[PDB]
Design an enzyme around this catalytic site. Structure first.
Site: not given
Ligand SMILES: [Mn+2]
Ligand SMILES: [Zn+2]
Ligand SMILES: [Mn+2]
Ligand SMILES: [Mn+2]
Ligand SMILES: [Mn+2]
Ligand SMILES: [Mn+2]
Ligand SMILES: [Mn+2]
Ligand SMILES: [Zn+2]
Ligand SMILES: [Zn+2]
Ligand SMILES: [Zn+2]
Ligand SMILES: [Zn+2]
Ligand SMILES: [Zn+2]
Lengths: 256, 256, 257, 257, 257, 257
Positions: F43, F120
């Site tokens: 990420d 998120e």
């Molecule tokens: Mn993630």
């Molecule tokens: Zn990811």
């Protein structure tokens, strides 16, 4: 009186109305200071210096902060000792921030924070920044703050030699040592019993810190250096040097 | 000494080791008190009372909180006055919370908070709750706290009658009035100048509050009632009654 | 048209605020035990009912009420150890009031009445107001005015008090679940009151100090601080008219058209 | 195998922690001006480079570093008034450290080394650690141990100090963008240093007090607190070996296998 | 017997929790603009009405609902620049949820259903739950279980979806003040809806990114994200039955008697 | 010339902001489990790589990325119960975004693009932005503009989706450690991916509600929400080209040079 707490609001108002009024705020702690000295040293000392400096330059002294940040092993022995009663960083920062906001409301614009507890420094700094940030929202940029730890004014090699003929050890280990104990002997002798001083070699630590704090790494008495050679004479010297130096510094930063 | 700040950490440790040590914490404020009296009244008075109670019951007194919650018009004149230096609610609450956490760490389990500034009450209450909540997280449920405002112990009809031969009009308007001024005349006469008292009629307000605070709704001097008839004698009586009453209450709640 | 902001469309609300002298009212209550004879949402229901009636008379608007308030204190609400009572931390209540004022100011509103119905909320509402006004001042806004009050404080007429308290006024703090609140409930929401379940006990008394953890024994078993035995719809109707009238007059004086 | 947690799969990380004596290292830096001759991510790059090499030697793992640190202070970093410097509030940094420790404890880790690379971060890292340990204690966890250090403190050997400062060592405080950091950068990331842009000014000196708002005039124009004119790749390699060996030995001492 | 906690006495509530398998439900809404045809308390009214019906069927209890929710977002609520919309900061909403869970746990309750009615509340409700459970763990409590859901997610049947949106499903985010909410309101509170005031604009569309400060021009003027022109009481009744049945079944499965 | 702020001198940075139209980009990721076949810093790596390429094409600068994000949620990231995943509390993430925006504004910057790489994080990034813009408003500053986006939202062209998923796209919800992220990683950092370790399970499905504490059994054992078996370097190169082109065009639209 030079103490804001001992003035009426009218007297205070008139002093601030003068235009160049300087306010001083002592910031201490409630902390263990060995077997020979009481625990309110960090409040008593900067408050006494503030009083003397204020008398000389015509300044005013605010009620001091009685509780400071958590004692650190390498500078104050550690927060595991009994008696030591410390605040969280956010609490100390918020207290400083709130006081500055209020002083600005009064119309004050000159503040001197005299730190007497080593560990308070960075939280005082944050409280100042947050208060100045809020003043900036109102377009106010003339509120000036001078922050200092009173011992930093004892630099003159000649003075250091008198106080430490065998050599200066550094401020970090001057917790309950010669410096603080001498000032106390000169200012509040009844709160010091030099006969109770537990002589021990100057504290030393590796280039890092461990948490949870290991009690074994701090001298049993709680002090970081011996005050065996502390004296009222050395205390009187330190006092005059600090008062003079700080008075000059303030006149320099906050002139008429 | 009965003051924790004047004890060595070893002396303090020893007192707590006794098992039934009672600690007392005065909570005041820096606030305007009219033209005739200084601004640290709310710290000085509960501290003086704590000292006397501590001497009688063998308790210890912690350094007092010098700054309290924002002054409210109906009880302290209002936070718009110069001199008055107030903390935000979260700051005062956090201070109380941090101190209780630390006292518990020391092993102390009995605390008396003596409020001297009307407005501090609910924030002291929240600080206590948050601290006890955390103590329970650690399985500690034997920490007990007693909170009180010293003036609540002056309720005996005969005493009120003697102190106010004209009639008691509540503690609300007792800001800078007969009660506080009399106590100060008995304890710190040099900090009071009765000749400067503005003899205005008792402050009255509608059944609601307005914000921003309207200065016109507070008597100009900042007092809510006149201290013209204040006296050293009234102060000595108040002191005697309060000390006796609080000492008895503490022995009741924290028996040997 | 409804007096409740929640029942208005945003266009209608916008128009009312655009008028220039719109007064908004916010009921602040709590979910708290109220003895064996009354439900737990009393502190919301009562101030909301008063706001509605005041709003109808002076042309004000009422905001959705705060359903949860500060921790119940033994001397004024029985104590927060009782089941049912669901309380917020002071910072939470303070922040809620703070957020609402911020948003109303954004709408262009400048007149707010906070009507408290739970004794313990007072100081946290005060802090919420101060923090919100502080932020408005950062933006140069100093014309937002707030009136805060607990509705019972308007019941002061010596004559009315005598009817409710024949043996003397007990004080607003021990009035928790007593004649005052129960009488209002009998008049407004009789179905939520069962006067026959009232446990008749002497008015609660306490020493001149508080103890924490709270000691359950120092609170009457039913949770009430004074008996509602003598409560009646009649007393409720009297209280209601006295409050509505007084509050309406106060707002008219503070927030003139 | 990589020594960086970010370059491992969760299964690989899980297995390492399952070993029982796994040591984790977290670099804590900042984005801050470093004169006209160096880039601004120095405080992240250096402790991360040191962590990597130490981890390779002692078999530890390195967590993603904290990229933003506390506000630059005049006497130690030039001041937060400079462009580029992007600082966090103390509460933010403290909370970040606090959250990471909480999570590592959840993983089952119990040994953490926080390697600070930005002078001003120290006390906020300390508060973050204290708050995290406090929470762990609530859950009955007391075996989580943390070692915190600023890597330059490991350069203690008088012989090493003399090689770096033949004319005298003036302290770590003014060692911002000076000989120490510049030398390390020349040895690790030469492309990010242009020694020819170094503004050779006298070492910064200040009175025994601090002034706020920070006065730009009291900081050397370039932003550096001491001249890096004498910095070199050779000095950098010495510093690197000295730090890596010393820290590796310290960790082996505090976290024995 | 009421299913609302607020309408119960503390004794009745205590008895219900004492049962050992009591399920509590908490409606989480908002005060937000909903076009020219509907009132602004829709997000509280709808989930509360669904909770009431579910509670009646499964023998659960309903707590007072949260009246104010998180800031309205352009792509799901029109934007927080609209008048009327009164939003809380994330920390405030999170803290409110956290405080409530702490209290319910103190009561001895261990089963909670959070029914969201305002799209934007979701992640803050999630954080409030995590922080509350974290604290309960400190207290040695690990048997408190929470079920969180947005009631519209239960309308999944393709057949039902087609009956509701003959032109095609638009996504729950742009269903702000559209057919779904307006139909439910028509079936539950027709007096709060004036379908004649509906502005029949095409469904709102946005680029694959967000812009702040929110740009008013990118939201349909009425504030709605989709037209409620085809809304009907009949569609409302269908939705209501699907939601109540689906949720009642889900709760029975997660919180078995 | 580097496009990374961390690799510039404060003078170089100052000059670029002085241009008056400088666009800054901030990657926001997480340290999170990504199955048995991929590392945990995905990420951070992906949005940073995209930012770099977009910045290269439009003349923007990239700030140090946020390495830790909000708690993993079961329906989008597997759940925060996995080892390795190290998450921040919402207040911490919001505060970090808020602090960075305050500093960039102080620098004189007025154009910011936040590129989210962790599902998120979205709502906490939003709150951080709002709090920062609120404070800027206190200073009369309203010309600071922020564009927020999750890079995957730019892969929307039906023709592209068809090429990437010749057997059908099933949404971004289940794209955690699946074909999309794994393909990008295979094209950018092949050494951090081992397709042979992929656990080819069917796409994860969940009921229309969430449960806390999170139930591990409801997440596929590997931690992935969909199988990356068919992932390939080619698919990764296509995704990269599409995302970079799309984002570059969007930024030019919102922040014209
Ligand atoms: Mn993630
Ligand atoms: Zn990811
Ligand atoms: Mn100290
Ligand atoms: Mn007072
Ligand atoms: Mn109440
Ligand atoms: Mn630095
Ligand atoms: Mn909504
Ligand atoms: Zn000291
Ligand atoms: Zn007073
Ligand atoms: Zn009540
Ligand atoms: Zn540096
Ligand atoms: Zn809605």
């Amino acid at each position: 009186s030079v103490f804001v707490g001992e003035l009426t609001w009218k007297e205070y108002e008139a002093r601030v109305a003068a235009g160049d009024c300087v306010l001083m705020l002592p910031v201490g702690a409630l902390e263990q200071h060995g077997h020979h000295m009481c625990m309110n040293v960090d409040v008593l000392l900067p408050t006494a210096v503030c009083k003397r400096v204020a008398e000389r330059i015509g300044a005013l002294v605010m009620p001091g902060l009685q509780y400071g940040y958590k004692s650190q092993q390498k500078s104050g022995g550690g927060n595991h000792f009994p008696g030591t009663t410390s605040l969280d960083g956010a609490t100390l920062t918020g207290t400083v921030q709130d006081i500055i906001r209020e002083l600005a409301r009064h119309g004050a614009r000159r503040l001197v924070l005299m730190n007497g507890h080593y560990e308070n420094s960075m939280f005082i700094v944050e409280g100042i920044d947050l208060a100045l940030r809020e003043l900036r929202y109102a377009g106010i940029q003339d509120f000036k703050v001078v922050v200092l730890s009173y011992w930093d004014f004892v630099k003159d090699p000649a003075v250091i030699q008198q106080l430490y003929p065998e050599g200066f050890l550094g401020w970090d280990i001057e917790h309950g040592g010669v410096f603080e104990t001498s000032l106390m002997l000169a200012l509040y002798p009844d709160l010091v019993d030099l006969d109770r001083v537990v002589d021990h070699p100057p504290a030393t630590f590796p280039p890092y810190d461990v948490f949870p704090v290991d009690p074994a790494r701090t001298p049993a008495p709680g002090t970081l250096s011996s005050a065996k050679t502390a004296s009222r004479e050395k205390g009187e010297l330190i006092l005059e040097v600090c008062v003079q130096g700080i008075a000059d510094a303030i006149r320099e930063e906050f002139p008429p």
